[PDB]
Amino acid sequence: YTIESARNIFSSTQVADAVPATTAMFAKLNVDDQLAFLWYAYAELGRTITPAAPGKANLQLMEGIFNDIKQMSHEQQTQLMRDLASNADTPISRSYAYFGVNAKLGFWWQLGEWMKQGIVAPMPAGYQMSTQVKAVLEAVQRIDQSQQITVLRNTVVNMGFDPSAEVINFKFPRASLSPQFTIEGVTEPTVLKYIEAMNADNFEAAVALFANNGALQPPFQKPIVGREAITAYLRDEGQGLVMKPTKGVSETIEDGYTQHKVTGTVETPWFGGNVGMNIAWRFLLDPQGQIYFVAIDLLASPKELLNLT
Ligand SMILES: CC1=C(/C=C/C(C)=C/C=C/C(C)=C/C=C/C=C(C)/C=C/C=C(C)/C=C/C2=C(C)C(=O)CCC2(C)C)C(C)(C)CCC1=O
């Protein structure tokens, strides 16, 4: 077995292809229209769901930058939004590039609030009734909420400077009591211990279960190899996630390796159970019961939760 061949481990599982397709569409817009799409897509989403406050302590990690953006002309604030959206090399764009996913999301969230108060100039958006942006809007609204918030996350993860260590990491309260999940059809300790570690916010215990040369493939992303790179990834994107697998199958294969497919929902700290992402986990364990490979898939539809062999 090789990482390349373990990527195919249950090949019938079907994924939300519309996510990268819709990001590719957003990429074809000019900056004026990328901003107009962000403003409207967020306002439209805010008809059903509003992201939860990320915390005073988390947002205090960027207090310096927030003070700058407040002691700044409406014209300066406008220019910053354009600079972040256009991938410009300015001081705050360079800083933004060292925010982790949640800090980037939190940066935008805290500006949203001050927009409501007039303390920050709104989105300086080109027109949102532009045909090009109206078409990318239609594509977003045609897909489920888990896909919409994923598209919205991607466009925000891709703003500011592109520099090819010092990443700001939001931390969040553990959600609930000891049994946060129960998996029908899977008692494999390594699988259970992974989900327990993630829900406990203990990413060292989660990565401890990986082989020295093991890998983690996030949704729509390349595999991440070895405990150091996996642990750094998870210290960013794993924070505040609650993982609610409910069913799966275990299979022994060649050389005393085992395969496991587990399905359920994942809840972001931002939306809680308002957006239950339908997720599969595909694990290849070597004979020592260690994780050689695990893929995480945003599933195509709720029907995929029941596709198990
Ligand atoms: C932009 C903007 C604004 C605001 C914009 C705002 C506030 C936008 C807010 C958007 C937010 C908060 C979206 C968040 C998305 C979260 C996702 C998709 C996470 C999924 C994680 C998963 C599946 C994790 C899975 C995983 C599992 C299960 C593992 O087991 C392994 C790890 C892994 C992590 C991979 C304004 C307010 C200013 C208006 C205009 C404007 O410009």
Is 206 touching ligand 1 by the criterion CB < 6 Å?
A: no
Place of tokens 């497919």: 261
Residue nearest to atom 19 of ligand 1 (CA): 268
Residue 289 near residue 190, CB atoms below 8 Å = yes
From 107, 114, 128, 156, mutation site for ligand 1 pocket: most ligand atoms within 8 A of C-beta: 156
Residue 292 near residue 216, CB atoms below 8 Å = no
**Which technique was the structure solved with, according to the deposited record?**
X-ray
Please state whether beta strands 224-225 and 242-252 pair in parallel, antiparallel, or not at all (unpaired). Answer: unpaired
- The alpha carbon of 90 and the centre of ligand 1 are apart by a number of angstroms equal to 24
From 34, 78, 108, 144, mutation site for ligand 1 pocket: most ligand atoms within 8 A of C-beta: 108
Q: What is the largest CA-CA distance in the chain?
A: 66
Residue 143 CB neighbours (<10 A): 16
Beta bridge partners of 166: none
What is d(CA 270, CA 260) in angstroms, rounded to the nearest whole number?
A: 29
Whole-number CA gyration radius for the chain? 20
- The alpha carbon of 151 and the centre of ligand 1 are apart by a number of angstroms equal to 8
In the structure encoding, which two tokens stand for residue 173, read together? 């309260």
The one-character DSSP state at 53 is: P
Residue 278 near residue 298, CB atoms below 8 Å = yes
What is d(CA 221, CA 260) in angstroms, rounded to the nearest whole number?
A: 20
User: Measured in Å, how far apart are the chain's first and last C-alpha atoms?
Assistant: 20
Using alpha carbons only, give the angle 101, 105, 111 rounded to the nearest 5 degrees. 150
